[PDB]
DNA sequence: TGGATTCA
DNA sequence: TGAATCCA
């Protein structure tokens, strides 16, 4: 996969240049979203473009999150965590990385949007409140760009659709990343739809192919 | 209907105290959300409380917007307006009031939330972007409070659910209003569910002016 | 399109 | 409470 669009607030540009551990976290997110390949035996990501909305997107999110957790030591909130935390402000931020950059504890929060545009507004606001409350020091949102979203689940959020609203994050360190497949064609399998599309074992096998 | 909860940003408080026409627009919204009665023969609003999620809420919004346009001259975006005004912003602000004052044109925009909490976040951000772009000078959001929402459509946005996020509006003139029924009991019919569980005719009859 | 409803 | 289907 490739990162074809990206927006970084001035505050995040500043933070990234002066904070090595925050920059490292950002680089790990970039590596995790660019790592996906398809088919699993390929070295690039080709999306099946047979017809509109023919592929699922959650499996890609699952792969991205597992890579961050298993390979880069990020923490992904588990169902048991979500159950005990979400009572007042909704579920917690999907995944994050934490580190003591001595004198203080810092955290980078990230969310991969696989829902509709309204859910993306909620995700951006969840991250913004986290920044305002000092719970995270940098927020990152990942989304497929429009060209790719055309072949993903109906009504899924795409980079360009949330873009008019990126300015609501000015003043805070926020980064939006838009990804795309390296190729489009009908000679590859469809990414399974439903959240159950790929089991917890298929994701592991795929991750294994991605890493070696 | 009654207003039981309300949050007004410091900037909105300031604006309301110094701008009479903006204060008037705000008073019209409050009057319009307090106007609803139920059943149509009562002077009060009693919501049927016999079963969780048993009533619709869209009809209340329909009534509220109609009162603002009809009685107070607000403008509510029509299907044809929405059809031509959408690119990457996601549809115009539901209703607004415009007026000339002190060498500048001012507008107040409002949205009544009848969708799920994610849609309320989108609505708040729509309004915030309008404020930031200078297209409106005051934003207002109406929502039923949690007690009432229990008896309205499953998953509808309620005041307390969005409240933790009101602070994302500080620095901008924004107002959030939480409304409630005056009474709860079984001796009233259910409010129909859906964009038209209650016809345009019925809403016309269901006035209270 | 959005609103609603029901199944997973 | 997200996903997919269906109609006011």
């Amino acid at each position: 996969m490739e990162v074809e669009k990206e927006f970084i607030t001035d505050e995040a540009k500043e933070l990234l240049s002066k904070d090595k551990l925050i920059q490292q976290a950002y680089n790990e997110v970039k590596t995790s979203i660019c790592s996906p390949i398809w088919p699993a035996t390929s070295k690039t990501f080709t999306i099946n473009n047979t017809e509109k909305n023919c592929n699922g997107v959650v499996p890609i999110k699952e792969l991205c999150y597992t890579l961050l957790e298993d390979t880069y030591n990020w923490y992904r909130e588990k169902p048991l965590d979500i159950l005990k935390l979400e009572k007042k402000k909704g579920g917690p931020i999907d995944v994050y990385k934490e580190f003591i950059e001595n004198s203080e504890l810092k955290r980078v929060g990230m969310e991969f949007e696989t829902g509709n545009i309204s859910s993306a507004h909620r995700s951006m606001n969840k991250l913004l409140l986290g920044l305002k409350h000092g719970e995270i020091d940098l927020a990152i949102i990942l989304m497929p760009i429009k060209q790719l979203a055309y072949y993903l689940t109906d009504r899924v959020t795409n980079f360009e659709e949330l873009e008019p609203y990126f300015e609501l994050t000015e003043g805070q360190p926020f980064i939006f990343i838009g990804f795309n497949a390296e190729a489009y064609n009908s000679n590859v399998p469809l990414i399974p739809k439903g959240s159950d599309g790929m089991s917890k074992r298929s994701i592991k096998k795929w991750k294994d192919k991605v890493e070696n």
Side-chain angles (χ1 to χ4, degrees), chain A:
Chain A
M1 277 280 203
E2 302 172 356
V3 164
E4 293 196 357
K5 302 296 185 180
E6 178 175 46
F7 176 70
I8 304 177
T9 62
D10 290 354
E11 290 77 14
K13 289 182 185 183
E14 179 57 42
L15 187 60
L16 287 173
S17 67
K18 308 200 171 180
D19 205 301
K20 302 298 178 183
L21 292 183
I22 294 299
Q23 185 179 188
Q24 172 182 173
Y26 162 68
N27 291 336
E28 294 173 344
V29 169
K30 276 196 52 47
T31 295
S32 81
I33 192 53
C34 286
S35 296
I37 60 182
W38 192 252
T41 56
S42 175
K43 303 290 173 164
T44 64
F45 193 113
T46 297
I47 187 74
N48 182 300
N49 69 347
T50 298
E51 62 182 295
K52 180 171 179 291
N53 301 146
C54 62
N55 298 277
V57 57
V58 169
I60 307 297
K61 176 213 289 180
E62 287 303 315
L63 173 61
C64 175
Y65 284 178
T66 301
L67 276 166
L68 291 171
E69 200 166 31
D70 297 354
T71 299
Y72 298 113
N73 312 311
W74 280 57
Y75 186 69
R76 199 238 274 228
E77 301 286 0
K78 308 292 152 30
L80 249 38
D81 294 313
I82 296 168
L83 186 72
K84 72 180 183 193
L85 294 164
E86 81 190 323
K87 194 57 175 295
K88 178 185 60 178
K89 307 137 60 182
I93 284 164
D94 285 359
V95 70
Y96 69 89
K97 199 188 183 181
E98 173 179 306
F99 39 86
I100 307 300
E101 201 147 14
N102 255 168
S103 299
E104 93 183 77
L105 181 157
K106 303 200 178 193
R107 216 174 261 125
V108 179
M110 184 272 281
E111 298 221 318
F112 187 137
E113 311 303 329
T114 53
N116 61 29
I117 186 62
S118 291
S119 75
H121 277 275
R122 184 169 78 151
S123 175
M124 179 175 77
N125 282 177
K126 176 197 302 184
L127 257 2
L128 282 176
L129 192 65
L131 285 163
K132 299 222 169 184
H133 286 355
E135 294 170 345
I136 59 172
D137 304 78
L138 169 65
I140 300 172
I141 278 178
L142 303 186
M143 303 174 146
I145 63 173
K146 182 180 171 190
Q147 181 192 19
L148 175 58
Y150 183 83
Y151 295 101
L152 297 182
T153 55
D154 192 27
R155 312 189 194 197
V156 68
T157 302
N158 65 248
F159 186 96
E160 292 88 337
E161 192 163 7
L162 186 61
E163 192 173 26
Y165 293 89
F166 291 170
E167 59 177 288
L168 298 189
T169 65
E170 306 188 321
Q172 296 288 163
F174 218 115
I175 292 170
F176 298 88
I177 294 171
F179 62 87
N180 195 193
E182 293 173 62
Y184 288 63
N185 57 250
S186 299
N187 64 186
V188 177
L190 300 183
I191 299 284
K193 282 290 185 65
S195 176
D196 278 333
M198 275 190 216
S199 71
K200 216 76 173 179
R201 135 104 281 199
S202 291
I203 290 294
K204 233 65 177 182
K205 301 174 65 169
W206 186 15
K207 168 167 148 288
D208 286 351
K209 276 289 187 296
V210 167
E211 292 186 309
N212 49 288

